[PDB]
Amino acid sequence: GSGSPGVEQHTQAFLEALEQGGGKPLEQLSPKDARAVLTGAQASVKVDLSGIEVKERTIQANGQSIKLQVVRPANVKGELPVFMFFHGGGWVLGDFPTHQRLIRDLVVGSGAVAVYVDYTPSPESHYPTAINQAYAATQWVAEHGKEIGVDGKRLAVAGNAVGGNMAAVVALKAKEAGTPALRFQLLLHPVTDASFETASYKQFADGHFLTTGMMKWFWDNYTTDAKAREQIYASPLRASSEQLKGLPPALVQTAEFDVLRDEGEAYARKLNAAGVTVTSVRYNGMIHDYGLLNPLSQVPAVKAAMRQAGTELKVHLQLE
């Protein structure tokens, strides 16, 4: 009673193992206990984190202190291009160490520096606190890149799930502010709409790791303000073609067996209809967050997806 026909074999086994593991629904836990689920699960897998050097940095931007983790390809001299990395976890969960293997794969694969932004979790904060932090840090990197060994003029945004939401919305905030210039947005199965009635939402409501109950809980912790949810900085799928016009080139990866699949692909279509350059790719057989979850990190399709994400970062961040 886990998964579906066509789920990739290792992923299916992972889903079945979780089912036998039992446990309360994530959304019935305290934020503290939910956070520990991800922490514990990520830590229980031997993973390759080599080839990077990590350094913390606190910045002052748009009137607040923001913590960064700068992840640089190891043994490389000189200024490097750079991508902001916005972590997923449904706004409630996630942090740098839970996401470090994913970030590492993107850094080693791209040859570019990642700047993880430690945005304030929900429900400790609500919309739009984190995205304002996300944007503030992005502008800071553009202006002050030399201080952390990067070329801030060659700048992308990237994230998984709500992190993909965050990357897409930071690109919109950058358009609104007229700064900074962005080369590329990498959206790994993004949340793009505060609604729950797409065909994929109905089909994969449960049994496929990310449940409908989880997503609704995530959104509720983020903000219960219906008017806020209707804003394009919360639900970018609601943007018009005019509002999307001029956004940077995008790679959108979606997972076949993901409640978020349809809104992610729909967002890619809206970008294309607005004249934005988009590569929209559905990874068949995959579940949500296949790039994040360390138990899936050696699944061949996941390795392929990660090679592509790193390559496309590289391609869009090179010297013109």
Add this chain to the structure above:
Amino acid sequence: GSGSPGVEQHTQAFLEALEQGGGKPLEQLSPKDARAVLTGAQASVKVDLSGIEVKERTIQANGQSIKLQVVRPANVKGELPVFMFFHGGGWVLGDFPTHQRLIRDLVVGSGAVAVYVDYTPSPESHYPTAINQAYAATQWVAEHGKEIGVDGKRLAVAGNAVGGNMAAVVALKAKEAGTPALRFQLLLHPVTDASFETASYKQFADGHFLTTGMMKWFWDNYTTDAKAREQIYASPLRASSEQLKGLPPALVQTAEFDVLRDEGEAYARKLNAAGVTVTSVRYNGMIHDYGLLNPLSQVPAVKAAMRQAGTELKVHLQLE
């Protein structure tokens, strides 16, 4: 022209590979460039860092801000015993990420929490700044342990090389202050004396990774004050039996092919002569910092040494 007869086979190969790699003597580099040597070398090796959860914490202790990295066994509930971890690197080099694999091995092997203390490097600071930070953080953990999920009443100190110096000296500062109580000191090939005329110093002056030139440079960056060097908080080997009396039980590991071997073993003898409980173990075939260097981390003797260090931590930190 690298190593010696009796150097363990993988270690010998490592030494020979380094020799073919060439490069300037470490002590002819800027501190920034020397630091990058360790960073780059550690990052170029795939290593297992699983089974731990890492969280940063800044504390206020004895009138200053001190950064900690708290490394906890993953998926474990409740208060755990705890060891301070003081990193090596000759006071000039080293930090948390360079030492993370070593710390991880100690944490996973012991079941105890590590508290890495980010002391100020030399020459940015000199003696006794770092050891005062080291001690301040140790007392803080003893008083405030519950805030980071540990039983501060079950507290050890641990470190490699100058970190071993630091652990030994923090135990002496704790005796001097009458607080906190310590269960155990783990000294991995400690620096114990600002002198360079032991038999091991003469025999292994070069060709065995840690050179005499390096040690002298390390000490010079730490402090060129001859009077400072004569203090027991810099050169604990100079302590009298009375001064050593009452120190906590010790495990001292030394490496056979290490300039520091003789002063480390001599310090173990002084502890024993003062009535302190000591286990003093020479790991034959090994070079300095065998537990730190990631290229050596799968050498069987190194794995054995790491199993022992973790076990002895565990044994001394249990409930009485």
